[PDB]
Amino acid sequence: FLDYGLSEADPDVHAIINKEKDRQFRSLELIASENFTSKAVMEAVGSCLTNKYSEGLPGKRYYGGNEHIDELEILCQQRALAAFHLDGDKWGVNVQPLSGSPANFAVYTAILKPHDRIMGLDLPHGGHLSHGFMTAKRRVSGTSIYFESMPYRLDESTGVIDYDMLEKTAALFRPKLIIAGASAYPRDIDYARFRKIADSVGAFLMMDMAHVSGLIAASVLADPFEFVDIVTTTTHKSLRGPRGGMIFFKKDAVHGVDLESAINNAVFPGLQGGPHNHTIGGLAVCLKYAQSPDFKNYQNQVVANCRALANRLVEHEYKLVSGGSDNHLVLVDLRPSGIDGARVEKILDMASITLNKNSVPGDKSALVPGGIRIGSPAMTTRGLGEKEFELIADLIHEGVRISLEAKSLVSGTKVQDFLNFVLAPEFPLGDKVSNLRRKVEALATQYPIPGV
Amino acid sequence: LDYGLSEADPDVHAIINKEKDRQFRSLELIASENFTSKAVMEAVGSCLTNKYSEGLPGKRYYGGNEHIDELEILCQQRALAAFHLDGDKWGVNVQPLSGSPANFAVYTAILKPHDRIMGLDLPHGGHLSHGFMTAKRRVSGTSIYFESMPYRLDESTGVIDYDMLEKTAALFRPKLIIAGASAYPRDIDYARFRKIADSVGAFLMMDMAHVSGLIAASVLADPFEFVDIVTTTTHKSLRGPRGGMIFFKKDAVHGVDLESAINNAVFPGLQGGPHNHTIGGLAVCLKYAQSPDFKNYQNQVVANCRALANRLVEHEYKLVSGGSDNHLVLVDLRPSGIDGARVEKILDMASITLNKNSVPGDKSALVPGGIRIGSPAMTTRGLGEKEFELIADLIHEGVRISLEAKSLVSGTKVQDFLNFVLAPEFPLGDKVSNLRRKVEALATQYPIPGV
Amino acid sequence: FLDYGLSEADPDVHAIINKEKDRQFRSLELIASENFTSKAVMEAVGSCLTNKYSEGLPGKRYYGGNEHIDELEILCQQRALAAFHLDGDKWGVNVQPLSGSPANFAVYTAILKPHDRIMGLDLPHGGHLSHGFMTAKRRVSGTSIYFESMPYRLDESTGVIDYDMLEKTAALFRPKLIIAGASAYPRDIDYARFRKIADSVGAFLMMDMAHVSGLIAASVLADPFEFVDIVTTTTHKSLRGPRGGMIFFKKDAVHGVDLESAINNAVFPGLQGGPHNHTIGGLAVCLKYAQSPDFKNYQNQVVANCRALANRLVEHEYKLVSGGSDNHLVLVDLRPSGIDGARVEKILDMASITLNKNSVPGDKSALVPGGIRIGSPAMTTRGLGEKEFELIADLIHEGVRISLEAKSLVSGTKVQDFLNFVLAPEFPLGDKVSNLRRKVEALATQYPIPGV
Amino acid sequence: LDYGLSEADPDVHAIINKEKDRQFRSLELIASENFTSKAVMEAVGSCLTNKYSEGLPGKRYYGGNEHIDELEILCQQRALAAFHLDGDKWGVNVQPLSGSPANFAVYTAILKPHDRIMGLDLPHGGHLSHGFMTAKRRVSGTSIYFESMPYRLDESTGVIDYDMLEKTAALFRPKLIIAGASAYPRDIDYARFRKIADSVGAFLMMDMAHVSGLIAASVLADPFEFVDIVTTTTHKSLRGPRGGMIFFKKDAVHGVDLESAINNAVFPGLQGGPHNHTIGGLAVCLKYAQSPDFKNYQNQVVANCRALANRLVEHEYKLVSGGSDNHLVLVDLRPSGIDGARVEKILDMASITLNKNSVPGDKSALVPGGIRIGSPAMTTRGLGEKEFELIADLIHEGVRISLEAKSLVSVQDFLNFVLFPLGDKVSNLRRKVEALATQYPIPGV
Ligand SMILES: Cc1ncc(COP(=O)(O)O)c(CN[C@@H](CO)C(=O)O)c1O
Ligand SMILES: Cc1ncc(COP(=O)(O)O)c(CN[C@@H](CO)C(=O)O)c1O
Ligand SMILES: Cc1ncc(COP(=O)(O)O)c(CNCC(=O)O)c1O
């Protein structure tokens, strides 16, 4: 009967999407985990695929009516293996996980018993919550509730994974699973050394490639599939797809375990219910694109842009964690500047520069992020080049100077006092912020943005 | 160059068109399925997908969340409004990725590993996420991480066995009792669940996934009058995007601050970045959920199911519990001389899509004794009571064809039935075609929502 | 060098031991778990066997110097088997458990994983703490901390194990281990029924015979070894041995498990260190006696004496749980007598009769036990026969009468109002308690007490 | 009928007399052994064994325990005085049946299942009860119900690597850190342990099983100055009966009432009836432990061990950590070119009883590269420093025989061959061994 378009069915939600669309258009989106997915992905995601229940696997379902859903799921699997240059007799893939966090949890449920041991990169050193996180007070991450996690750390003087200390701690702790891959690690991973450490204790070895999956597909970074047993990823970051997840696994037995059975059973019936076939349609689209020469070019540009930005930030005298980057991000250490990342993040956000505060090695308190994380994928997608990334670094720097100036004016010491002060109409640096914003937007609006 | 899907990926475009077709010309009777709206689809296929927004509105871990926050706030208040809830008494988290993670997040919030849980037994119409163990394996993640024990229907009445639940709860001492089901054809006695829960100091939760739209429109009783926590999928009877929600009391329950424990279990506990495109779609469906049209829809859903239920009875089918108060029937096929698996397959060949389902009394999990049939999806397309009677007839014809096919197969292993019916010399293909003709003739008289 | 005897080395301890010896002598010891062990047992226990570390098993020890400890432990093992008429090719035994509770915990450790499911007789219905016990509000026994226990119960009227209900709850609960055996149960156990119920869920089946081991060995009660997988026991109580434990196990695989290796490994290196070879010495000695015609005699006397007492109590109109007993104990339901076990136990204690207050099926309050448990083995060891046990029944009866009269004089229903009443100098029933005590000590002091 | 043991059971009588003769004539050098007194054996071999006393003094299940209560109370106040403890600040539970259950009761009292524990690694002289896992199995029950990770010695010094424990404790976040060990020749830096425990909010426990007598006599440092909980065996250094004790602060520790928790874990948590015969002997041994004579014996323990160590140095053996502060030495036998397993059997055949013990640096933990040797037992019998120098020579002689025995063999085949040409040298060693030992008294009944 009536089936209005959005602008008619819900004018308020329509208006919100248009405001977000305009914010994306005019901003420098520098969140390392964000990207702009294509019109074609969004169209697959916003289709009738959302209507189908298809619990199980292709050909192996608990409902009728899944002929076309099976075709899509098979295609998406083939494309996943193709994008990562994988032999299908050696590697399988499950494309049903709903996001990165549940793809990881499904792996643990597949190969680990409750309270089995896991090692991942420490959260304050650039790791991800889903690999484990405990404070003195509480088990924060669900992974640390259901499993026993102990982190490994960077060498704080170099910003590089302290592989020698991991060698020793692994031997004492006896993890059943060692996880490589990170949220805010600016260097490539020594997969061979992980393999040697994992073998020293008979551990399973996994790479979580959520941040760098597109770079790996394009052969810009080293291939984790040469060394690891299991690879997890999100589909929304460097891969530039819909919000979702994937798990890849060896098909030959690993420590006597059939990883394919274990992982497919953990995803379903273990942890999830019906697959989101709309998300799978978008994933298939992005995985086609991931095989193209343009994508390889794009990913090489991501790294070149991040290098141009890193080099300019160094020229503005910023300290980078690890001294630089091999990938799509940099982590800036703002302690020498004398300001935290939460204050910087806000000022920059007010000038249309969106990044995130990020902890830094050496931070005294997790409640106070000492740095900022900046990535090139999103703005690279829009067509910015090396020179424009140098300008981004200059605009970031203007914003930090403004952050420092605004800090000096605030009475109270809480972040909430800063936020109230800087958002107040009578904020004295309103002109400096509006001036910066105009420059930020003048750059951003020169470029196209993908999407519907 | 940012091509449309037809140009960017014609192979995926083609598959989507085939599925649009299949939906158009089939009778979709899966009780958990529905056809979501064009407006929901437009929201889900928007630029909201691009944003990382960990945390909660105005308490985020990233910059740039002004409009994302507006949306999530609007989504929450529409959630509460759609269920007629006072926001001083009830809170909501709209970020869960689906039904299964909503439920796992609640367990994570209020239980410790190995704590005791009771939920409706899987073969008596329950859900895996509420606990399932066979003799030799813990199948559900709920039964890996927690200690589960089911409760059951009374097989003579097809109604939940409240008297037995009262007794088993007393012995097992669950910390959490879960009401709600996937294939239960009646309303739930919330007052009796509350009494049983209080009898052991257990948390009490309702999983309203299948029935949330009927509860919203006040067609079934209100769980929120009695339980502590309500979970749901945003798909199914709510007719939204694929996602989930968790509602909770704000007054402390057995001393626990449920708002804090639940929000923290969702993030940072179990999930990362919220799916804001899904949250957009959810907001759209929650607006619609408050409309008089949606109320009309939900009453039609019940009337359509009852019309189908009666005609199956006229064809002498046994229904679990003798009928239905809601959107579904569970057909006990044992007295028709055939299992659900054989029937599901033949019906699917005829463009009638439903599912095989366990029936209480089944001597074996591996042979489902019934089929579950639902009205929401075809009701959304505009079918009425007479049309549901015709559906009942077509199912009957299909079950007759299934019996005839079973007669011709040596093994009566299932794989044998399948090979037989799928072979090109399958001798009943004309009967399946003839049925299929009648099925599509009906379905293709009706519009279907979406982009 | 001055290695004095106890009288000189430690006069205070010597004096305490002597006072205890005299208390034992002038008292009627009717606690059903108690006995008087022999002089020969006490000599082995108080020997230089205490000096040796012998971690491991015979011929497979971590230390040197164990030729003679080996001989002893090998001999203890073959006497344990022989006393229970066990074929060594079907049954093995570990004689190192430090007591009854460590014996049971070693079995759990052997055959279960943490949080596995166990069913045992409910503590308020006469089971033991070590088989599982939880209040609404806490996990009291170690077994309920480390494992998931659910009790089964007696029938409220018959006094008997409600086998039918156990059939149904084990079906639902799916325990991995079912434990038969009780601390305060007056009937023999239907072992064939426990086997059927066990098999219906694939559970291991265990008997804890601590209270009845002597009766089983003398073939007075039915043989659990015909039907169960594992039997545990204390070496004290019914066996009249030193304070220790043993575990017996099938040597054929049970549900795919090698119990011998599992159980032995659990005991050592799992849970215990150096065996207490002095105690194994005393155990060997009691097991020789356990095979003797005099022990078989004594055990039939234990049952006859308990029946004599029971019958005389029924003449005095007392109600017995299950209307009687097939074993060494009787459980008196005092609810129809109008008084509880705690008031009765206390009066009886004031008159040198030691028994214990006991919960009865139906009791409203765990704080107010409705009964008393009475046992014959200790006094039967001293040489009492049936006519003496009939006299014991009359002495108890007089104590109940005194207890009733004391209750009627105290206005409180508060138990400490009762205690204050009975302990006051002006306590009106002082001469009645003195009179009863005279008769009690007059009976008791006619019989010897074994020991050094 | 109630015969004596020689009449009741001649075969057990005969075995006990053989074991008595073996103890009398041998050099008993197992570091964990001692010879307890006639007075302890008499208390342990008493009517005390008959009584059920579930609970605590005045707080029992059953009646008839007036004398059992008096006994336990006295035992507790002797335990506090033997270790110079203020009873307002410290309590003790004297019911644990041995060292292993004492420890497990502490874990049960203060930890939840799967909570984290760190103790000295087993191949580095630790104890099973503190945790032990291999690649393929959780060997200790401690490692099944709880999550253990070890800490290690610095292999170049033979001392605990406190810097490494500092770092690994920060990563692993143990809820309990355990100090104390079965084969560690040095005193412990309790102040450092406290510092490390505090860095992660952990409970800190000392297991003083091997060194309690030395601590009571003030020969080694006092753990009670720094730790929350002290467990011990009562055999070993303290020279008592076979049992355990747990000491605890009575001031709240990280908001835990340790007294209530530990008492409840012992009973009703894990054990039943106390072994009052054993508490009797313990009480006797704790009176002796307060005396001037005990203090002299413990100083003699340390002097004797130093005499042996220094003679084994003259004979050019390597000692793990370069000596000892205590009652034991750990000899590194790899530079002598033979393992501890072969040496142990040959020494035992000549009536020298010690044990094979791993060395920091073993390649396979199937092959111990060393031996542990202790002075407590022979010190109790009256031996001085000259005799421990003679013991050192006798061990030396037996090692030379073990090498020559290994030379005549070409791998448990060593045990086929010895059980023989070298019988004469084994027997000649034995004669001198037994000639030294039988010159001294032995305590006991
Ligand atoms: C290595 C890794 N693995 C898994 C995930 C989880 O993905 P999800 O947010 O889709 O659950 C992330 C997300 N990472 C987000 C969270 O900060 C980011 O902005 O970096 C990740 O970095
Ligand atoms: C520190 C510590 N804690 C606990 C125990 C266990 O005491 P138990 O054997 O009485 O259980 C020991 C015994 N240790 C034995 C093990 O070989 C020994 O010979 O040293 C111990 O050394
Ligand atoms: C009661 C109930 N709860 C939770 C879920 C899980 O929803 P997800 O599949 O999105 O995780 C379901 C799905 N049940 C599937 C069906 O009835 O067909 C359900 O029926």
With a 6 Å cutoff on the Cβ, whether C270 touches ligand 2 is no
How far is the C-alpha of A203 from the C-alpha of A87, rounded, in Å?
Answer: 24
With a 6 Å cutoff on the Cβ, whether C274 touches ligand 2 is yes
With a 6 Å cutoff on the Cβ, whether D99 touches ligand 2 is yes
Give the torsion through C-alpha atoms of A415, A417, A420, A421, to 10 deg: -110
The helix (H) or strand (E) run that includes residue A338 is none
Contacts of C169 in chain B (CB under 8 A): 171
Query: Which amino acid does the sequence have at B122?
Result: L
> CB burial class (10 A; 0-12, 13-18, 19+) of residue D110?
buried
R_g (Cα) of chain A, nearest Å: 23
Is the separation of the CB atoms in D331 and D371 below 8 Å?
A: yes
Q: Which residue is listed with tokens 């219910």?
A: A273
> Residues A29, A122, A148, A208: which is the catalytic one?
A208
How far is the C-alpha of C341 from the C-alpha of C332, rounded, in Å?
Answer: 9
Is the separation of the CB atoms in C142 and D108 below 8 Å?
A: yes
How far is the C-alpha of D215 from the C-alpha of D83, rounded, in Å?
Answer: 7
**Which token pair is B202?**
């257990």
Q: Which residue is listed with tokens 């020793």?
A: A168
Closest CA to C378 of C443, C302, C293: C302
Where is chain C broken, named by the residue before each break, C–N > 2.5 Å?
Answer: none
Write the CB contacts of C427 (distance below 8 Å, at least 6 apart in sequence).
Answer: C421, C433
Q: Which residues of A102-127 are buried (b: 16+ CB within 10 A; e: fewer)?
A: bbbbbbbbbbbebeebbbbbbbbbbb
How far is the C-alpha of D237 from the C-alpha of D32, rounded, in Å?
Answer: 7
Is the separation of the CB atoms in B319 and B83 below 8 Å?
A: no
| Local structure of B356: helix, strand or coil | strand
Q: What is the resolution of this structure in A?
A: 1.9
> CB burial class (10 A; 0-12, 13-18, 19+) of residue D239?
buried
- Subunits in contact with chain B (3 or more CB pairs closer than 8 Å): A, C
List the alpha helices (DSSP H) in A291-385: 293-315, 341-350, 377-382
Cis peptide upstream of residue A448 (ω within 30 degrees of 0): no
Distance of residue D130 Cα from the nearest chain C Cα, in angstroms: 11
How far is the C-alpha of B270 from the C-alpha of A128, rounded, in Å?
Answer: 12
- Helix axis angle, B10-25 relative to B429-443, nearest 10°? 90
The dihedrals phi and psi of A276, each to the nearest 5 degrees, come to -90, 90
Closest CA to A273 of B267, B244, B348: B244
Q: Which residue is listed with tokens 């339901």?
A: C333
The dihedrals phi and psi of C374, each to the nearest 5 degrees, come to -130, 130
| Local structure of B178: helix, strand or coil | strand
Closest CA to D29 of D342, D351, D318, D397: D351
How far is the C-alpha of C71 from the C-alpha of C59, rounded, in Å?
Answer: 9
Interface test with C, best of D46, D54, D74, D145 (most C CBs within 10 A): D46
Write the CB contacts of C376 (distance below 8 Å, at least 6 apart in sequence).
Answer: C30, C32, C302, C303, C305, C306, C309, C328, C329, C389
How far is the C-alpha of B128 from the C-alpha of B120, rounded, in Å?
Answer: 9
**Which token pair is D324?**
């000892």
How far is the C-alpha of B262 from the C-alpha of B249, rounded, in Å?
Answer: 11
How far is the C-alpha of A447 from the C-alpha of A438, rounded, in Å?
Answer: 15
Is the separation of the CB atoms in D116 and D149 below 8 Å?
A: yes
- Sheet containing C329-333: order of strands: C319-320, C329-333, C371-375, C356-358
Asked if A33's CB is within 8 angstroms of B67's CB, the reply is no
Give D258's Cβ-side CA count (13 Å radius).
Answer: 23
Closest CA to B78 of B359, B284, B295: B284
Query: Which amino acid does the sequence have at A336?
Result: P
How far is the C-alpha of A361 from the C-alpha of B179, rounded, in Å?
Answer: 47
Q: What share of chain A is helix, strand, coil (3-state, %, to 5)?
A: 50, 15, 40
Is the separation of the CB atoms in A218 and A295 below 8 Å?
A: yes
- Helix axis angle, B340-349 relative to B385-407, nearest 10°? 110
Q: How many CB atoms lie within 10 A of CB C306?
A: 26
How far is the C-alpha of D165 from the C-alpha of D154, rounded, in Å?
Answer: 11
List, in sequence order, every residue forming a beta bridge with A118; answer none if it has no partner.
A149, A177
Is the separation of the CB atoms in A344 and A357 below 8 Å?
A: yes
Distance of CA C129 to the CA centre of its chain: 12
Is the separation of the CB atoms in D24 and D442 below 8 Å?
A: yes
CA-CA distances (angstroms) from residue D224 to C113, C189, D110, D230?
A: 36, 51, 18, 7
Q: How many CB atoms lie within 10 A of CB B21?
A: 12
Check if D233 is active-site.
yes
Is the separation of the CB atoms in B19 and A68 below 8 Å?
A: yes
Nearest atom within ligand 3 for CA of residue B126? 1
DSSP H helix total and E strand total for chain C? 17, 15
**Which token pair is A122?**
């420490």
CA-CA distances (angstroms) from residue B254 to B119, B166, B208, B230, D429?
A: 20, 20, 22, 16, 75
Distance of CA A304 to the CA centre of its chain: 19
Distance of CA B332 to the CA centre of its chain: 20
Beta strand spans in A199-312 (E): 204-208, 230-234, 245-250
Write the CB contacts of A214 (distance below 8 Å, at least 6 apart in sequence).
Answer: A237, A238, A239, A240, A290, A295, A298, A299, A302, A377
Ligand showing the shortest atom-to-Cα distance for residue B374 = 3
Query: Which amino acid does the sequence have at C43?
Result: E
How far is the C-alpha of A203 from the C-alpha of B311, rounded, in Å?
Answer: 60
Cα-based angle C262, C267, C271 (whole degrees, multiple of 5): 120
How far is the C-alpha of C389 from the C-alpha of C394, rounded, in Å?
Answer: 9
| Local structure of A139: helix, strand or coil | strand
**Which token pair is D93?**
């539970």
Is the separation of the CB atoms in B185 and B321 below 8 Å?
A: yes
Is the separation of the CB atoms in A190 and A163 below 8 Å?
A: yes
Query: Which amino acid does the sequence have at B8?
Result: A
Cis peptide upstream of residue C269 (ω within 30 degrees of 0): yes
Closest CA to C30 of C440, C450, C452, C442: C440
CA-CA distances (angstroms) from residue B232 to B162, B180, C39, C267?
A: 23, 10, 73, 50
In this complex, the residue of A33, A129, A271 whose CB is nearest that of residue B141 is A271
Write the CB contacts of D285 (distance below 8 Å, at least 6 apart in sequence).
Answer: D36, D37, D40, D234, D238, D239, D240, D241
Question: Which technique was the structure solved with, according to the deposited record?
Answer: X-ray
Is the separation of the CB atoms in A30 and A375 below 8 Å?
A: yes
Write the CB contacts of A87 (distance below 8 Å, at least 6 apart in sequence).
Answer: A81
Distance of CA C7 to the CA centre of its chain: 32
Write the CB contacts of A93 (distance below 8 Å, at least 6 apart in sequence).
Answer: A77, A80, A81, A86, A246, A247, A248, A249
In this complex, the residue of C5, C17, C102 whose CB is nearest that of residue D46 is C17
Q: What is the DSSP annotation of C109-156?
A: HHH--TT-EEEEE-GGGT--GGG--B-SS-B-SHHHHHSEEEEE-B-T
Query: Which amino acid does the sequence have at A70?
Result: D
Write the CB contacts of B198 (distance below 8 Å, at least 6 apart in sequence).
Answer: none
Write the CB contacts of C177 (distance below 8 Å, at least 6 apart in sequence).
Answer: C107, C108, C111, C112, C116, C117, C118, C119, C203, C204, C205, C206
| From A31, A122, A130, mutation site for ligand 1 pocket: most ligand atoms within 8 A of C-beta | A130
The dihedrals phi and psi of D328, each to the nearest 5 degrees, come to -120, 160
SS (H, E, C) chain D: CCCCHHHHCHHHHHHHHHHHHHHHHCEECCCCCCCCCHHHHHHHCCHHHHCCCCEECCEECCCCCHHHHHHHHHHHHHHHHHCCCCCCCEEEECCCCCHHHHHHHHHHHHCCCCCEEEEECHHHCCCHHHCCECCCCECCHHHHHCEEEEECEECCCCEECHHHHHHHHHHHCCCEEEECCCCCCCCCCHHHHHHHHHHHCCEEEEECCCCHHHHHCCCCCCHHHCCCEEEEECCHHHCCCCCEEEEEECCCECCECHHHHHHHHHHHHHCCCCCHHHHHHHHHHHHHHHCHHHHHHHHHHHHHHHHHHHHHHHCCCEEHHHCCCCCEEEEECHHHCCCHHHHHHHHHHCCEECEEECCCCCCCCCCCCEEEEECHHHHHCCCCHHHHHHHHHHHHHHHHHHHHHHHCCCCCHHHHHHCCCCHHHHHHHHHHHHHHHCCCCCCCC
In this complex, the residue of C13, C39, C47 whose CB is nearest that of residue D283 is C13
**Which token pair is A317?**
């005298």
C148-152 and C177-180 strand pairing: unpaired
Is the separation of the CB atoms in D330 and D125 below 8 Å?
A: yes
Is the separation of the CB atoms in B331 and B318 below 8 Å?
A: yes
**Which token pair is A139?**
């088990």
Contacts of B71 in chain A (CB under 8 A): 13, 16, 20
How far is the C-alpha of A410 from the C-alpha of A416, rounded, in Å?
Answer: 11
With a 6 Å cutoff on the Cβ, whether A381 touches ligand 1 is no
Q: What is the DSSP letter of B205?
A: E
How far is the C-alpha of B359 from the C-alpha of B361, rounded, in Å?
Answer: 6
How far is the C-alpha of C299 from the C-alpha of C237, rounded, in Å?
Answer: 13
Distance of residue D195 Cα from the nearest chain C Cα, in angstroms: 31
The domain of A129 spans 72-290
CATH of the domain at B125: 3.40.640.10
With a 6 Å cutoff on the Cβ, whether B356 touches ligand 3 is no
Nearest-CA residue for atom 17 of ligand 3:
B182
> CB burial class (10 A; 0-12, 13-18, 19+) of residue B410?
exposed
**Which token pair is C110?**
């052997």
Query: Which amino acid does the sequence have at B159?
Result: V
Q: Which residue is listed with tokens 């020298």?
A: D352
In this complex, the residue of D5, D12, D63 whose CB is nearest that of residue C349 is D63
Write the CB contacts of D83 (distance below 8 Å, at least 6 apart in sequence).
Answer: D90, D215, D216, D224, D230, D247
**Which token pair is D347?**
């020494």
A28-29 and A60-61 strand pairing: unpaired
Asked if B16's CB is within 8 angstroms of A37's CB, the reply is no
Q: What is the DSSP letter of A424?
A: S
Is the separation of the CB atoms in D221 and D190 below 8 Å?
A: yes
Is the separation of the CB atoms in B234 and B285 below 8 Å?
A: yes
Phi/psi region, residue B201 (left: phi>0; alpha: psi -120 to 50; beta: rest), is left
Query: Which amino acid does the sequence have at B242?
Result: R
Contacts of A148 in chain D (CB under 8 A): 114, 116, 147
The helix (H) or strand (E) run that includes residue B324 is none
